[PDB]
Design a protein around this ligand. Structure first.
Ligand code: 3DL
Length: 271
């Protein structure tokens, strides 16, 4: 087939630090993909990690091509955009939507952790939605290996996004990777259910974080959250990463297992 390798770049999906992500459509097949364009004038590790990833709740990597000093990563196109834009400021979203998105997030994060990868920057801006509203973890630019040859490596680089970062990343020289991603998921869950972030950062100097540790859940955002998901958040947003709930135990949580959402509305008729 002549021309199958030609993609037209038709729309900008986002500017970034690295550069820019474009929606690309195949000239022949009309298959759409996202093309991440990074001006090298870091990326080898992102590509390398991306080559490892194969999961329905993680953005698929198709390959890459370099043309001089410009790298082109070919990635799954997610037409639903960012989860961020499904969160209504000060409101959140319907609890059954949040639960479903949270289920899919855990699935992605379990997968990543199982192959020894930590994302390190989980937040609604990086969680994308496909045409069926399936959640996809995107952007492995900050990601790293925390397990190799069945041997865990402790992290020491501070990175991520302050409102989503776990307190230990600010307090300790070294920390385990997995509890940090769990914490960020908890912040994402809070945002989905309240449409606001609980604190600027999880530090002793942040009054809102102090209020949470003092269990003042009569305040916002917590007063907006039903008691069942709030009981889960109490187990996730635990300052001590060694006492913080793990994902296997999240999967056992009462709200996590609460029937809330009917299946995707399929067509039907009556007589
Ligand atoms: O690896 C990355 O950094 C990356 C991977 C995929 C995308 C991607 C893939 N599909 C859609 C969108 C996107 C992002 C924001 C808004 C929007 O309408 C679409 N973004 C972006 C970055």
């Amino acid at each position: 087939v002549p021309f199958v390798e030609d993609w037209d770049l038709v729309q900008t999906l986002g500017e970034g630090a690295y550069g820019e992500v474009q929606l690309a459509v195949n000239r022949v097949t009309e298959e759409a993909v996202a093309v991440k364009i990074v001006d090298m004038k870091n990326i080898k590790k992102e590509i390398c990690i991306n080559k490892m990833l194969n999961h329905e709740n993680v953005v698929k990597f198709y390959g890459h091509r370099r043309e001089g000093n410009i790298q082109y990563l070919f990635l799954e196109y997610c037409s639903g955009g960012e989860l961020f834009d499904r969160i209504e400021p000060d409101i959140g979203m319907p609890e059954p939507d949040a639960q479903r998105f949270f289920h899919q997030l855990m699935a992605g994060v379990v997968y990543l952790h199982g192959i020894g990868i930590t994302h390190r920057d989980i937040k609604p801006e990086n969680l994308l939605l496909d045409e069926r509203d399936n959640l996809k973890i995107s952007d492995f630019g900050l990601a790293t290996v925390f397990r190799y040859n069945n041997r865990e490596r402790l992290l020491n680089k501070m990175c991520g996004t302050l409102p989503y970062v776990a307190p230990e990343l600010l307090k300790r020289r070294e920390f385990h990777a997995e509890p940090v991603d769990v914490w960020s998921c908890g912040i994402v869950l809070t945002a989905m259910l309240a449409g606001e972030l609980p604190w600027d950062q999880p530090s002793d100097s942040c009054q809102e974080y102090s209020d949470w540790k003092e269990k003042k859940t009569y305040l916002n955002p917590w007063k907006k959250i039903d008691s069942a998901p709030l009981a889960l958040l109490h187990k996730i947003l635990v300052e001590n990463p060694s006492a913080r709930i793990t994902i296997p135990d999240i999967k056992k949580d009462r709200w996590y297992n609460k029937p809330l959402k009917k299946g995707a509305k399929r067509p039907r008729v009556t007589s």
